[PDB]
Design a binder for this molecule. Structure first.
Ligand SMILES: Cc1cccc2c(=O)[nH]c(CCC(=O)Nc3ccc(C(=O)Nc4cccc5cccnc45)cc3)nc12
Ligand SMILES: [Zn+2]
Length: 205
């Protein structure tokens, strides 16, 4: 029951998402083995997701978390990359498909940095890469990330479910020497995929 709203490149909504996409790119210390080598993206499409039923599922849970956290939902816009993006925009987020082998338990992981979620679009650690060329650093095939609303509530700083009294877990693991933040929820209701971003990484040369 979802419909997608095509945003024009000359739109403030489009540009803020585009900006947050480009500005949050980091220089991963794994030589781009996971997500590929790039500085910026070639942003092809940014579609806003509309689903009243899933939005009501979210705002309902958001209110519940606010009450449990001194009326502070701790709402944040975060990126999510996975091969199941197109399933999520219709069925919503679902903890029953959570990353079981995750560092912070079976949950739904997000990131501050767009480039960090990019490492998970084709699978954990990039998987085998794109379906056609089997290249984790493919500059041809289009990729898709979600730019979601995320109710963190009272987040627990660590280093399955949420620890007691909390609603999410915030980490900052140092992969290959660089520390970047992570965010995990253990209930799909605490996230709404607001924007679907179709893009591709640019060959830096
Ligand atoms: C470890 C880490 C750090 C920072 C960012 C990420 C990230 O963006 N993605 C990932 C991948 C892990 C992850 O969140 N996986 C994942 C979590 C949730 C879902 C999900 O909600 N899937 C689904 C939701 C609804 C229906 C589905 C039907 C079939 C299959 N999946 C469905 C699918 C995949 N990991 C990150
Ligand atoms: Zn490819």
């Amino acid at each position: 029951g979802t419909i997608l709203i095509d945003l024009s490149p000359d739109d403030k909504e489009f540009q803020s998402v585009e900006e947050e996409m480009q500005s949050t790119v980091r220089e991963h210390r794994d030589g781009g083995h996971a997500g590929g080598i790039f500085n910026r993206y070639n942003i092809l499409k940014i579609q806003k997701v509309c689903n009243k039923k899933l939005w009501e599922r979210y705002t309902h849970r958001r209110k519940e978390v606010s009450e449990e956290n001194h009326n502070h939902a701790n709402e944040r816009m975060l990126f999510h990359g996975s091969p199941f993006v197109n399933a999520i925009i219709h069925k919503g987020f679902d903890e029953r498909h959570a990353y079981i082998g995750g560092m912070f338990g079976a949950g739904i992981y997000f990131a501050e940095n767009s480039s960090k979620s990019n490492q998970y679009v084709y699978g954990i650690g990039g998987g085998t890469g794109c379906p056609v060329h089997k290249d984790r650093s493919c500059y041809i095939c289009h990729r898709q990330l979600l730019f979601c609303r995320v109710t963190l509530g009272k987040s627990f700083l660590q280093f399955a479910h949420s620890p007691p009294g909390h609603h999410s877990v915030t980490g900052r693991p140092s992969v290959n020497g660089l520390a970047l933040a992570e965010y995990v929820i253990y209930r799909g209701e605490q996230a709404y995929p607001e924007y679907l971003i179709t893009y591709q990484i640019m060959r830096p040369e």
